[PDB]
């Protein structure tokens, strides 16, 4: 009686409202659905988590003074190339990249992890071009 492995399953699209939800918590549930660890047929070594689309990423909310005290930094490899970016500016420019950074901070690494991050699609604002994919709305 070997442990069961499922066959390949079509990923079920899932829409998620970025508005009104906390950054960390929402990113948590997003990562959870992304892994497919909501499915009884779950298996680690294969990306069978669901495709996820989010809208109103700008409409995310964050507790405390994290608007400014949270500094998304980057590194160019160049001396003094540490580019600190506060959370506010990062909202004004790339809020979708904010959620990308937060959820990517929670995914398991490795090529499976990167493909999983490909499996996610953020859209700041209320719209997205995936109606053909039938994005199932799912409150969290």
């Amino acid at each position: 009686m070997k442990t069961y492995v499922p066959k390949q399953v079509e990923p079920r699209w899932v829409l998620i409202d970025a508005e009104g939800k906390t950054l960390g918590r929402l990113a948590t549930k997003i990562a959870t659905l992304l892994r497919g660890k909501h499915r009884p047929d779950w298996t680690p070594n294969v990306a069978m988590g669901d495709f996820v689309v989010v809208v109103n990423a700008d409409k995310i909310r964050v507790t405390g003074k994290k608007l400014e005290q949270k500094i998304y930094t980057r590194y160019s490899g160049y001396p003094g190339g540490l580019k600190k970016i506060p959370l506010e500016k990062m909202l004004a420019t790339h809020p979708e990249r904010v959620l990308e950074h937060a959820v990517k901070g929670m995914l398991p690494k490795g090529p499976l992890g990167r493909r999983l991050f490909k499996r996610l699609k953020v859209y700041a604002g209320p719209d997205h071009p995936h109606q053909a994919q039938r994005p199932e709305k799912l409150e969290v």
Binding site: S76, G77, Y78, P79, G81
Partner: protein, 204 residues
């Protein structure tokens, strides 16, 4: 933002107000637009300028169709003037006027695998007092075990020039309408005959 294609014909000083104002002479026009970069079509504003004309028997079908969608004769070189919607269909030197400030973008003369002195003006080493075989080397290039590597962007040998270069805030000494020639004070990047782009200066 006004601009025009052009070619560096050479340099020369001339006399205005008892000053031998050195200028570079630049055959700019005429420049026919071939495609206008529109935001609805391309997400921004710009035009596409042909200069100089090209042999019809030396043009591929794709470009030929590109001039059929346009109306211009087949033309050798084609560039974009960002954020420039010329009402006219062939920009010429008339868009500028002598005394107007411009910025010129060209490819400086390719100096090949430039040494480190000529490329970055490193002092090199002494010529005597025992300098062993190092008269033009950069000396040290880093630090010891901490951090024990080479930072990115450390100046070294490589291709000095042969690159898109823009000198800025030049002055239109004089325009030459009949010739499509333009007179700009100072020097322009690139060799004589090397293509260039003349643009209004972004200064103020």
């Amino acid at each position: 933002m006004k601009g025009i294609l052009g070619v560096k014909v050479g340099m020369t000083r001339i006399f205005r107000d008892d000053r031998a104002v050195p200028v570079t002479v630049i055959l700019a026009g005429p420049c026919p637009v071939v495609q206008r970069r529109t935001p609805e079509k391309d997400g921004y504003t710009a035009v596409q300028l042909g200069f100089l004309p090209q042999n019809p028997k030396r043009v591929n079908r794709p470009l030929k169709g590109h001039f059929a969608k346009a109306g211009v004769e087949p033309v050798r070189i084609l560039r974009e003037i960002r954020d420039f919607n010329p009402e006219g269909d062939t920009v010429t030197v008339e868009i500028f006027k002598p005394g107007e400030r411009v910025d010129v973008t060209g490819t400086s003369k390719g100096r090949g695998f430039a040494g480190v002195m000529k490329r970055w003006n490193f002092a090199g080493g002494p010529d005597s007092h025992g300098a062993h075989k190092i008269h033009r080397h950069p000396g040290s290039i880093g630090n010891r075990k901490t951090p024990g590597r080479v930072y990115k962007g450390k100046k070294m040998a490589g291709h000095y020039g042969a690159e898109r270069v823009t000198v800025m805030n030049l002055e239109v000494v004089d325009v030459i309408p009949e010739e499509n020639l333009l007179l700009v004070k100072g020097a322009v990047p690139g060799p004589n005959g090397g293509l260039v782009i003349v643009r209004e200066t972004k200064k103020a």
